[PDB]
Design a protein around this nucleic acid. Structure first.
Length: 70
DNA sequence: TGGCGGCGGTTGGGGCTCGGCGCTCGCTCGCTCGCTGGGCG
């Protein structure tokens, strides 16, 4: 985003039977139409670095909450 | 000259019905916004 001075909020919780989080990032420098590409790039960077090639099996392991269900 | 007993209709009420309006889920597709690749040569 080229903007280290930005507000955020993270919260680690426990779902019904799996751990999850609720990260929040400001929209400064990142519009809505570009959020998808940045999220996909961050997802691709996560693998082959933090997990060392291995990928998780839990569906929706890294996405963004959408307005409508679909 | 005399009265005491049952049978077809109801006729609104509980119920099915077809419609309206109202909402709530899948699909979409011109647009956008990057990422990168022969070629410059």
């Amino acid at each position: 985003s080229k903007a280290p001075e930005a507000l955020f909020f993270v919260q680690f919780e426990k779902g019904e039977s799996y751990f999850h989080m609720h990260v929040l990032v400001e929209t400064t420098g990142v519009k809505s139409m570009v959020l998808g590409r940045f999220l996909s790039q961050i997802r691709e960077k996560l693998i082959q670095r933090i997990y060392r090639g291995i990928e998780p099996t839990l569906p929706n392991w890294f996405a963004v909450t959408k307005t409508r269900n679909g």
